[PDB]
């Protein structure tokens, strides 16, 4: 009744027509890269880098 | 973010050099020797 | 190979003097080399083509 | 669509069967057609088993074409054993390629 | 019940301002949840060479104590309501925003009146945070997308204050202390320049006696009154190429001179972006896809990604396209996305327009879902057109775009011009430069 | 208004409508499929499925979908977890029945031909290589497997040795058992109710009844570890819960906001976490500890997650895990219950916010409870969690039987034993 | 068969590309004018004698 996105933690992926696969609610979760260098994807299989957030209008 | 652009205001033509005001003004103005300079190559190659 | 005794009796006809049969022969056999090659040719590959069921 | 002399076109379709001469050869109807871009899509698009059958035969005939021999006549493919097997997959393929050009002018 | 009447329902935002100068902005919903904060007119192309870092500095302090609230008891206080505490820093803006419950909506004013006011640069959370920063630039290296995007400004914009980053050089970082940081509190933070803005379950009468009581001690008529004013900046075709053969993947952006904010062009230049459109080798339909380059790179497998992009700015832009491939197909790539410039300045046709119009409408309305996306148009609208223009505006000029003004529009900026260039990673095939430059014009019109 | 009309057809279906007066309409359908409801000869058949959406239907070529739907603006995406399948549109209130009649040929009347489903095998092995560039994906996959002997141990994502052999018959047969009219919701956001009804009896001619029969998960407590050249370790540590829909549930959540769940300001350090600031005692590298809740229909998992570097991998572990031993024997005080409280009621009307997070909360309550509740209701049963049951919902962690997963250079990991 | 030419759009491109192919008609009436010297024009305007 309550989701699996509304207690955080198990996963969710997303497959689209015109947008990007994503993974997950609170997988890479906030202060992890605020200490040390959590440096990111070195990209091999390059999917997006900011996710769609243009074209506001 | 340490690297920047040097200079090139040794080959900047005569009135783009101090980067004040002229984005795309004044293109015109400034592109109007490259172009019909060519135009007596053709009418030098025409005959 | 209608189209081959075709070509054969125009080099005959272009040998000959013009007097009466080498002149309605000589253009009747212009006639059948465009005929054959631009009308014959293609109603006759349909006819084929609808007697194999395509 | 003529109902009463359907049986006299029946004739002309087996008598010009006979005139051509893939059968003797042993090739199937479908084996003969000239191979456009859209018969290469139907090929690729057919069962492997349906496939293989299709390559062997047609070396076949090109084997015996080299040395200016037919087939035993027990083994030419006779007229109501051919097998349409390419038919329904090249009807799909013209029948999308339609559907692209009617959507580029409208 | 129709897309028309649904636009006239959409509820109005009303500005007032106070006697100090600040603009006090609202939109009403009627929900439980809201979402205020201040929005500056702030950035890095307000400093010079000295300060560079100073304004990312700041912003870094802004949620570590202030004079009536000293260190982590702000802290607790956000969090034992269930609020949170965000901000942002451009090159030319600035934000700091709480999003909470309705019936907190006097605490969460008060909180932000304090930060922007009040706030301690204390002299032992400095050179704390210059370690954070330090090593902060080093992630963003690896990001290939962040490296190339400050590549262009530096070379588009190459002897102005609109070349430099935001977050500075490293040698400004290591030196700068905190005179420099009073001092640009002081001559950036100031009531003229700043937006209050909220969206949600909120009423404006109250939101304006909150201000009265927590907004009005900034004073209003600048020190010694001397007065900004926009020193322009001009574009500049050029092009810097980094070198590296142990990356993977390569990273290519180009970008012609785009119209300011406050353009009538902006809107059918938009029209035009999305009709070359956007692609990812995760998307679902590739080959069949009504975009001709992401048909085709879908087809021959020819990049990771491309997007086109808008970029505007008070008096200038940038405007272009960024994509991803391998060491192998990346003159291919520059070959088929400059065909479609050139094929949109003529030959373009009223059936794309009719789908390009169509998909800004819908990026218009989705935007707009949610109190913080709300909350964030009305805080950059005021400082950018000095006014909110509703979504019954924007859809009376794009209802005039059709096939002859794209193909005047895009003349008029695409063809025939320098454009600027910038690449990293196994950039080989990269084509030289005179190579790109012929390719924007062709020589039968 | 008009808060949300409901209605239960006579063969199972739900159907759900709200009548907003926004410009823009989303349509959901969801359904009880996913991963849960494969067995060892088909693993990997609802990967497939999930990236099939475009593909030729009975009543659409995948030309028709690609264009149809891309000339108005629209989109179209698939949402799956272990337990639910979702299929979503979205486009301008003018154009929503054009885009419904897709909808209804993408779930009710698929083709899957030969070719079509042997180009879109090598499409698995790119989802999969995107998604585990996050070391959190293959952590929580084994985790699952680590904790479950079945129905809850089948990952999201494809087998390596499956890639290539998913074939045809296998689809026809899963979508022909699982997707049932009497496990399906229907949820509409811009929309009227009587167009939605009429579009119901479009796929009411077929496919009814409720499906097969999955079986209960049997928990195992078990580990994996997976030594490889990561530069952090990732650790989680479990116990079996409680399922969705009791109040036990309750009780577990509030215990996560008592010992942390995620940062609420941009940079802070965490000032009320109890997890994180027992941690930083001892311990001056950077890190990141949570806690963990996962629950389902017939099984939960709760526990904690860190992230640390390896030579302080044990020494995170057993702080973190000697602050729940804390809790569990009486240490709880009322002032912190009470702020656990507000961060879980603010939480659940933050995420309901938007269109999309409205849809899913109102198509996952129609599968699991097979009704409609106000968050008004919600907000009560939160309120009525008392002191003396977060107390007994951390002594069920500390006395049962724990799942582990591991990933990084493992050198300093203890056991699950030790 | 050529009605690939047949279009309610496609004859829409020769709305904007015969602007173009107004013109170089007119190189012709002015090049080889120009290169074989032809002595019927060179009576048109009394530039040229
Ligand atoms: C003189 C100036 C030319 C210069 C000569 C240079 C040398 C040229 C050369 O090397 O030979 C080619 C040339 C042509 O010979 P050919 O017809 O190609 O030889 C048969 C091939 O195997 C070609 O095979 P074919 O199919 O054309 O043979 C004709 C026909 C049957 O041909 C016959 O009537 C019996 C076969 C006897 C040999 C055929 C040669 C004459 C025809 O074959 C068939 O019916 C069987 C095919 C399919 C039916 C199914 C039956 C199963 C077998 O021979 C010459 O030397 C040129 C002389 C003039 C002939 C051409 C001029 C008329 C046109
Ligand atoms: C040498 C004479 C060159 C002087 C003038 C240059 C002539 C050609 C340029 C005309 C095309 C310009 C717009 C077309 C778009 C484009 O990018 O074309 C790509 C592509 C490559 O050349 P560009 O990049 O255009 O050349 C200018 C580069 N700075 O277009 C072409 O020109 C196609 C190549 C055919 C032209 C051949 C090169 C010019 C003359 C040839 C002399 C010897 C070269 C090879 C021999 C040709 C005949 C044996």
Redo the contacts between chains.
Sequence with gaps: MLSVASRSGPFAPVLSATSRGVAGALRPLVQAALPATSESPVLDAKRSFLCRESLSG | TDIRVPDFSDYRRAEVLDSTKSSKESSDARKGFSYLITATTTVGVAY | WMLVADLITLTWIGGQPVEHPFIIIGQLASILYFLIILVLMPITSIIENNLLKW | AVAASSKWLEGIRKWYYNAAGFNKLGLMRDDTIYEDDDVKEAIRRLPENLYNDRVFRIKRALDLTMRQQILPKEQWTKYEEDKFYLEPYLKEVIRERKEREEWAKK | ???A???Q??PETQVSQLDNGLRVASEQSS???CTVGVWIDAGSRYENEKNNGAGYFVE?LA?KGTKNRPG?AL??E??????????YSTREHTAYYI???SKDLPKAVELLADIVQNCSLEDSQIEKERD?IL?E????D?????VVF??LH??AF???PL???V?????NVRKLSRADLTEYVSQHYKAPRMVLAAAGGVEHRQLLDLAQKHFSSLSGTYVEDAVPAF??????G?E?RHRDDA???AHVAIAV?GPGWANPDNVPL?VA??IIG?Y??????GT???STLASVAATRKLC??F?T?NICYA??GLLGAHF?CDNMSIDDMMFFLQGQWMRLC??A???EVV?GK??????????L???TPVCEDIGRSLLTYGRRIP?AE?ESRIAEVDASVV?EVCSKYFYDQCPAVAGLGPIEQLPDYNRIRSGMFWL?? | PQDLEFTRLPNGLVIASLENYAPASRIGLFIKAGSRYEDSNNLGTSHLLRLASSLTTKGASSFKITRGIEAVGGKLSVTSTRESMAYTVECLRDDIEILMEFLLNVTAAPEFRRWEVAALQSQLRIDKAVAFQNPQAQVLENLHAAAYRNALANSLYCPDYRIGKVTPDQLHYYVQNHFTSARMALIGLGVSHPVLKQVAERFLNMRGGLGLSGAKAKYRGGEIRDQNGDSLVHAALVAESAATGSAEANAFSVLQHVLGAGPHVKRGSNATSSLYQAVAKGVHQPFDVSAFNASYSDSGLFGIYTISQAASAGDVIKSAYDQVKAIAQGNLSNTDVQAAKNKLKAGYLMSVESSEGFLDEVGSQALVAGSYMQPSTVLQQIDSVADADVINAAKKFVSGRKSMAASGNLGHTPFVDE | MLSRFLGPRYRELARNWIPTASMWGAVGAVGLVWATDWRLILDWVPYIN
């Design positions: 019940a129709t897309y009447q649904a636009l329902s959409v929900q439980p949840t870094h949620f982590s802290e607790k956000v969090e034992s309501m269930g609020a949170h505490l965000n901000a999003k909470a419950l954070v090593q630039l080093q992630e963003n690896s990001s290939m997308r962040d400050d590549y530096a070379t190459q002897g102005t070349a430099q980053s977050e500075g050089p490293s040698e020193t322009p900046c001009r574009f500049t050029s810097i990356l993977p993947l001179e938009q972006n999305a956007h990812d080798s995760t998307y679902g339909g069949h896809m009504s990771q990604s997007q992009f008096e200038t991803v003529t030959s046709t009223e059936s789908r169509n998909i800004l409408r819908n990026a218009l309305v989705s935007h879902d949610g109190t979504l924007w193909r039968r019109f």
